[PDB]
Amino acid sequence: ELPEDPKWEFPRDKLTLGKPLGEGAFGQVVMAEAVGIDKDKPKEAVTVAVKMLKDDATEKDLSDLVSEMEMMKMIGKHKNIINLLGACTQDGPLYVIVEYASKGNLREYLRARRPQMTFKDLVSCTYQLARGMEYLASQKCIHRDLAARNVLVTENNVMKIADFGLARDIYYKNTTNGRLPVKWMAPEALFDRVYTHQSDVWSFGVLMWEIFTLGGSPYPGIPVEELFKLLKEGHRMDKPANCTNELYMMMRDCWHAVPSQRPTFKQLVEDLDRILTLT
Numbered sequence: 057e058l059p060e061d062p063k064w065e066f067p068r069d070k071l072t073l074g075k076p077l078g079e080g081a082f083g084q085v086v087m088a089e090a091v092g093i094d095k096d097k098p099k100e101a102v103t104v105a106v107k108m109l110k111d112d113a114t115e116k117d118l119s120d121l122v123s124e125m126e127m128m129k130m131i132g133k134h135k136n137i138i139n140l141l142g143a144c145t146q147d148g149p150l151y152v153i154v155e156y157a158s159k160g161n162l163r164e165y166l167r168a169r170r171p172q173m174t175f176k177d178l179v180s181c182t183y184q185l186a187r188g189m190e191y192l193a194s195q196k197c198i199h200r201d202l203a204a205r206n207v208l209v210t211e212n213n214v215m216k217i218a219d220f221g222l223a224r225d226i227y228y229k230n231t232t233n234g235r236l237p238v239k240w241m242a243p244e245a246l247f248d249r250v251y252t253h254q255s256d257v258w259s260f261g262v263l264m265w266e267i268f269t270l271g272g273s274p275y276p277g278i279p280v281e282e283l284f285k286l287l288k289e290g291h292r293m294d295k296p297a298n299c300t301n302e303l304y305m306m307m308r309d310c311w312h313a314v315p316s317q318r319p320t321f322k323q324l325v326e327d328l329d330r331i332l333t334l335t
């Protein structure tokens with residue numbers, strides 16, 4: 057039932073599934089070996105990650121996995137985003153083949169290095185993620201689910217933005233009864249059901265907070281049900297212990313009530329470049 061797309065199709069006999077990397081909401085991800093998936097090296101086997109449906113998959117899971125695949129097709133290549141490598145869509149189960157990150161997600165990566173991480177490492181991480189998001193915004197893509205659990209870390213410690221299941225090509229009108237994680241969402245997205253690049257910028261501020269707390273959970277002790285009201289009233293998180301004033305002012309700026317008053321990803325890249333260049 058899935059229409060052909062030769063540019064992205066990859067032969068099943070060149071794909072060898074291996075160890076499971078983890079299951080989530082609507083699917084499963086497994087490590088695999090793909091032979092010749094790098095066209096400029098057709099005989100090499102490269103370790104990749106494959107996203108597929110589970111046995112208890114719903115019809116919605118299938119269209120979601122397809123929709124996620126289609127987003128990643130139009131996004132483009134970049135060092136700081138998990139990139140689509142290919143797909144097996146014909147004569148069998150849907151396999152979405154993406155770059156493999158051996159060190160898992162940033163949240164767990166940071167939590168397991170709690171006392172090891174230097175301050176500059178954290179600034180580097182933040183810088184890389186700002187770059188991925190700058191590129192992403194330049195492709196007119198809003199992520200809508202930016203968070204530490206959705207960043208993946210490679211063997212060489214490159215930060216890669218992942219999980220494009222909620223990403224959209226663009227204002228955008230969010231649906232009522234939202235499917236966006238509340239603690240990472242800008243007030244516009246939550247209250248006005250609108251989404252812009254500046255909405256991702258707010259999420260990035262929460263991402264910054266996660267990074268400098270070495271994987272802390274945002275708005276600790278505050279139930280999701282009460283968070284809506286507090287944000288209206290101007291509630292914001294505290295400065296993490298391991299954070300300069302400069303970097304804290306950056307977070308607070310990403311958390312400006314007025315979207316146009318928040319920095320752009322290009323601005324954040326500029327500032328983070330400067331801060332990294334020192335340090």
Ligand SMILES: Nc1ncnc2c1ncn2[C@@H]1O[C@H](COP(=O)(O)OP(=O)(O)CP(=O)(O)O)[C@@H](O)[C@H]1O
Pocket residue numbers: 077078079080081082083084085105107138154155156157158160161205206208218219
């Ligand atoms: N390209 C990749 N390389 C290595 N591990 C990956 C990966 N893609 C996903 N994973 C891992 O497989 C698991 C499933 O992620 P998935 O995105 O499919 O579900 P999910 O989004 O509901 C969990 P989360 O919301 O925290 O990202 C995750 O633990 C993730 O760390």
